[PDB]
Amino acid sequence: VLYVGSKTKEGVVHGVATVAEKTKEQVTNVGGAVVTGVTAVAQKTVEGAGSIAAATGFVKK
Amino acid sequence: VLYVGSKTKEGVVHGVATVAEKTKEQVTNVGGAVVTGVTAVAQKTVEGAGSIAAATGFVKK
Amino acid sequence: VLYVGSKTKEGVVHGVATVAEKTKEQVTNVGGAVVTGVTAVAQKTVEGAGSIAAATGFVKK
Amino acid sequence: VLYVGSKTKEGVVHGVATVAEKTKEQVTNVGGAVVTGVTAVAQKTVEGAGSIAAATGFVKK
Amino acid sequence: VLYVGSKTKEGVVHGVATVAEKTKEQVTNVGGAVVTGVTAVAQKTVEGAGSIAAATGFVKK
Amino acid sequence: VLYVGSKTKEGVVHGVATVAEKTKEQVTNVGGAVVTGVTAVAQKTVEGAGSIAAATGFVKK
Amino acid sequence: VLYVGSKTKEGVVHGVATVAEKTKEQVTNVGGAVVTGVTAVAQKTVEGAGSIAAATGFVKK
Amino acid sequence: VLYVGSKTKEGVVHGVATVAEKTKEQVTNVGGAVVTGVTAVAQKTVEGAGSIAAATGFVKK
Ligand SMILES: Cc1ccc2c(c1)sc(-c1ccc(N(C)C)cc1)[n+]2C
Ligand SMILES: Cc1ccc2c(c1)sc(-c1ccc(N(C)C)cc1)[n+]2C
Ligand SMILES: Cc1ccc2c(c1)sc(-c1ccc(N(C)C)cc1)[n+]2C
Ligand SMILES: Cc1ccc2c(c1)sc(-c1ccc(N(C)C)cc1)[n+]2C
Ligand SMILES: Cc1ccc2c(c1)sc(-c1ccc(N(C)C)cc1)[n+]2C
Ligand SMILES: Cc1ccc2c(c1)sc(-c1ccc(N(C)C)cc1)[n+]2C
Ligand SMILES: Cc1ccc2c(c1)sc(-c1ccc(N(C)C)cc1)[n+]2C
Ligand SMILES: Cc1ccc2c(c1)sc(-c1ccc(N(C)C)cc1)[n+]2C
């Protein structure tokens, strides 16, 4: 009955340095799912599913 | 009955430096799903599904 | 009845330095799922499934 | 009834330096699931399944 | 007699990302010389002295 | 008599990522010379002295 | 008489990632010379002295 | 008479990752010379003295 939060962190990203030097980056997709290059991502979910970088081929029900 | 939040963080991104030097970046998609290049993203969901970089091939019900 | 959080961390990423030098990066997908290059990702889920870099081939029910 | 958290850490990644020099990185997927290159990832799940880098071939029910 | 320069670089700085988070930065100088915080500086000198971040206490001739 | 330069580099800095988190940075100088924090600096000198981060106490001739 | 330079490098710095987390950084100088924190520095000198991070106490001639 | 340089390197630094976590860094100088923290430095000198991190107490001629 006396919750006291103070300077708390939940789902936090900080202090990120990235260098990426590429000559050729190619993605070829035929009927599927491709996720590429996810950087410095943060989230908080309450009462639900939390997905960040999810690829599902297909759902053929 | 006495929740006291103070300087709390939930789903936070800060301090991000990114350099990307590419000569050729190509994406070719035929009937699928492609997600590429997600940087410095933050969210908070209450009572729901929270997705950031999600690719689903297809839903053929 | 007297929860007192103070400077706590849950699902936190900080202080990350990355260099990536490639000449050719290629992804070829035919009806599947490919996830590539997930860096500096943090999340917190309450009452749900938490996935970060998940690839599912397909769901043929 | 008197939980007192102080400077605690749960699912935390910090102080990570990575260099990756490649001439050719290729992924070829035909109807499966491929996950590649997951770095500096942290999460905390309460009352749910927590997966980071999971690849499932397919679910044919 | 046939100098042919092509895409040459001399005194060049490029692709620099910097983050600096400080709570207190102080400089106290009494009769001296202080240089602080020189970032991403480039020069080319022909037939002369080239100095970038030089501090000389004093010249009492 | 047929100098042919092509894509040459002399005094070059590139691809630099820096993070600096400090609580207190102090410099106290009394009659001297202090140089601090020189990052990503490049120069080319022809027929002269080339100094980057030089501190001389004093010159009492 | 047929110098042919091609993709040559002289005094070059590239691909540098640095993280520095300090609580207290102090410099106290009384009549001397202090150099601190020189990162990712490159130079080329022709027909002269080349110094990068040089500290001289004093020159009392 | 037919010098042919090709993809040569002279005084080159590349691919450097550094993390430094300190609680207290102090320098106290009284009439001397202190050099501290030189990282990822490259130079090329022709017909001259090349010094990188040199500290001289004093020159009392
Ligand atoms: C910081 C924080 C976050 C959530 C949170 C609390 C504190 S306390 C609490 C709670 C949940 C269920 C019940 N009952 C049904 C008896 C009573 C309290 N929640 C859900
Ligand atoms: C900061 C914060 C946010 C939400 C929050 C609390 C604190 S505490 C609380 C709560 C949830 C359910 C119930 N019952 C059904 C007994 C009673 C209280 N919520 C929903
Ligand atoms: C920081 C924090 C977050 C959540 C949290 C607590 C502390 S304590 C608590 C709780 C859960 C279930 C029940 N009952 C059903 C007896 C009573 C209390 N929750 C849910
Ligand atoms: C830090 C922290 C996190 C969770 C947490 C506590 C403290 S204390 C607690 C709890 C769980 C169940 C019950 N009952 C049903 C008697 C009472 C308390 N939880 C769930
Ligand atoms: C790219 C470039 C820049 C300058 C440069 C050359 C090429 S070639 C040259 C030269 C210097 C001195 C003399 N003599 C006194 C015989 C003859 C030529 N300079 C001065
Ligand atoms: C790329 C480059 C840079 C400088 C440079 C050359 C090529 S070639 C040259 C030279 C210097 C002296 C003389 N004499 C006095 C015979 C003739 C040529 N310099 C000075
Ligand atoms: C790339 C490069 C840069 C400079 C350079 C050469 C090649 S070749 C050369 C030279 C120096 C001295 C003399 N004489 C006095 C006979 C003749 C040639 N320089 C000065
Ligand atoms: C790559 C490179 C760099 C320097 C360089 C050469 C090639 S070739 C050369 C040279 C020096 C002296 C003389 N004489 C006085 C006969 C002739 C040539 N240098 C000085």
Query: How distant, in Å, are the alpha carbons of B56, D19, E61, F38, F52 from that of E51?
Result: 57, 32, 22, 13, 6
Q: List the chains bordering chain H where 3 or more Cβ pairs fall under 8 Å.
A: C, D, F, G
**Amino acid in position E1:** V
Closest CA to G55 of H37, E47, F21: H37
Size of interface F-H (CB pairs under 8 A): 7
Decide if F30 and E30 are in contact by the 8 Å CB cutoff. Answer: yes
Closest CA to A43 of A27, A54, A28: A54
Q: Which residue of C has its CA nearest to G16?
A: C19
Chain centroid to CA D23: how far?
25
Name every residue whose Cβ is closer than 8 Å to that of residue D56 and which is 6 or more positions away in sequence.
C54, C55, C56, C57, D33
Residue D12, sorted as left (phi over 0), alpha (psi -120 to 50) or beta, turns out to be beta
CA angle (E32 as vertex; E28, E33 as ends), nearest 5: 85
Name every residue whose Cβ is closer than 8 Å to that of residue A58 and which is 6 or more positions away in sequence.
A31, A32, A33, B56, B57, B58, B59, B60, C31, C58, C59, C60
Where does residue F6 rank: exposed (0-12), middle (13-18), buried (19+ CB within 10 A)? middle
Where does residue E2 rank: exposed (0-12), middle (13-18), buried (19+ CB within 10 A)? exposed
For residues G22 and H10, what is the distance between their CA atoms, to the nearest angstrom?
34
Contact C11, D43 (CB under 8 A): yes
Cα distance between the two ends of chain B? 47
Residue found under tokens 């970032």 = E39
Beta strands F50-56 and G50-56, pairing class? parallel
Contact G53, H41 (CB under 8 A): yes
Contact A52, C53 (CB under 8 A): yes
Dist. CA G10 → ligand 5 center (Å): 19
- Judged by its nearest atom, the ligand closest to the C-alpha of residue C2 is 3
Chain centroid to CA A36: how far?
10
For residues G7 and H9, what is the distance between their CA atoms, to the nearest angstrom?
9
Burial of C14-39, coded b for 16+ CB within 10 Å and e otherwise, reads bbbbbbbbbeebebbbbbbbbbbbbb
Contact B18, A21 (CB under 8 A): no
Find the helix or strand (DSSP H, E) in which D26 lies.
strand D9-30
Give the minimum alpha-carbon distance from E21 to chain B in angstroms, rounded to a whole number. 9
Dist. CA A1 → ligand 4 center (Å): 14
Q: Which of B14, B23, B60 sits opposite A23 (nearest CB)?
A: B23
Dist. CA A12 → ligand 3 center (Å): 22
Closest CA to G34 of E5, A52, E55: E55
For residues B17 and A60, what is the distance between their CA atoms, to the nearest angstrom?
41
Cα dihedral C57, B47, C49, C35 in deg (nearest 10): 40
- Extract the tokens encoding A48: 């639900």
Dist. CA D45 → ligand 3 center (Å): 15
For residues F27 and A24, what is the distance between their CA atoms, to the nearest angstrom?
47
Contact B56, A56 (CB under 8 A): yes
How does DSSP classify residue B4? Answer: B
For residues G25 and G18, what is the distance between their CA atoms, to the nearest angstrom?
17
Name every residue whose Cβ is closer than 8 Å to that of residue B37 and which is 6 or more positions away in sequence.
A36, A37
Query: How distant, in Å, are the alpha carbons of D17, G37, H29, H31 from that of F57?
Result: 37, 18, 11, 8
Overall size of chain E counted in residues: 61
For residues H12 and H8, what is the distance between their CA atoms, to the nearest angstrom?
10
Beta carbons within 10 angstroms of residue C61's beta carbon: 9
Contact H35, H53 (CB under 8 A): yes
Q: Which residue of F has its CA nearest to A15?
A: F19
Q: Which residue of H has its CA nearest to C18?
A: H17
Closest CA to F5 of G12, E8, E11: E8
Beta carbons within 10 angstroms of residue D14's beta carbon: 19
Strand positions, DSSP E, chain B: 9-30, 33-46, 50-56
**Amino acid in position D40:** A
For testing the chain D interface, which of C1, C2, C29 should be mutated: the one with the most D CBs within 10 Å? C29
Beta bridge partners of A61: none
Kindly list the residues of chain B whose beta carbon comes within 8 Å of any beta carbon in chain F. Answer: 15, 17, 19
Chain centroid to CA B6: how far?
26
Alpha helices in A1-61 (DSSP H): none
Q: Residue A10, CB half-sphere, CA atoms under 13 Å: how many? A: 20
Coil, strand, or helix at residue F7? coil
Give the minimum alpha-carbon distance from F22 to chain H in angstroms, rounded to a whole number. 10
Dist. CA E13 → ligand 6 center (Å): 26
Where does residue A32 rank: exposed (0-12), middle (13-18), buried (19+ CB within 10 A)? buried
Residues of C annotated in the binding site, as ranges?
14
Dist. CA H54 → ligand 8 center (Å): 29
For residues A48 and A42, what is the distance between their CA atoms, to the nearest angstrom?
15
Burial of H27-58, coded b for 16+ CB within 10 Å and e otherwise, reads bebebbbbbbbbbbbbbbbeebebbbbbbbeb
Contact C37, C27 (CB under 8 A): no
Kindly list the residues of chain G whose beta carbon comes within 8 Å of any beta carbon in chain E. Answer: 29, 31, 33, 43-44, 48, 58
For residues H28 and H47, what is the distance between their CA atoms, to the nearest angstrom?
36
Contact C34, A34 (CB under 8 A): yes
For residues E36 and G29, what is the distance between their CA atoms, to the nearest angstrom?
14
**Amino acid in position H37:** G
Beta strands A33-46 and C33-46, pairing class? parallel
Cα dihedral F27, F30, F34, F37 in deg (nearest 10): 10
How does DSSP classify residue A47? Answer: S
- Extract the tokens encoding D9: 């850490």
For residues C2 and G31, what is the distance between their CA atoms, to the nearest angstrom?
57
Decide if H19 and C15 are in contact by the 8 Å CB cutoff. Answer: yes
Give chain D's count of helices (H) and strands (E).
Answer: 0, 3
Decide if C17 and G21 are in contact by the 8 Å CB cutoff. Answer: no
Residues of E in contact with B21 (CB under 8 A): 15
Residues of H in contact with D15 (CB under 8 A): 19, 21
Q: Which of A10, A49, A57 sits opposite D58 (nearest CB)?
A: A57
For residues G20 and F6, what is the distance between their CA atoms, to the nearest angstrom?
38
Overall size of chain H counted in residues: 61
For residues C10 and D43, what is the distance between their CA atoms, to the nearest angstrom?
7
Contact F49, E49 (CB under 8 A): yes
How does DSSP classify residue H47? Answer: S
Contact D46, C50 (CB under 8 A): no
Query: How distant, in Å, are the alpha carbons of F59, G41, H19 from that of G48?
Result: 21, 18, 35
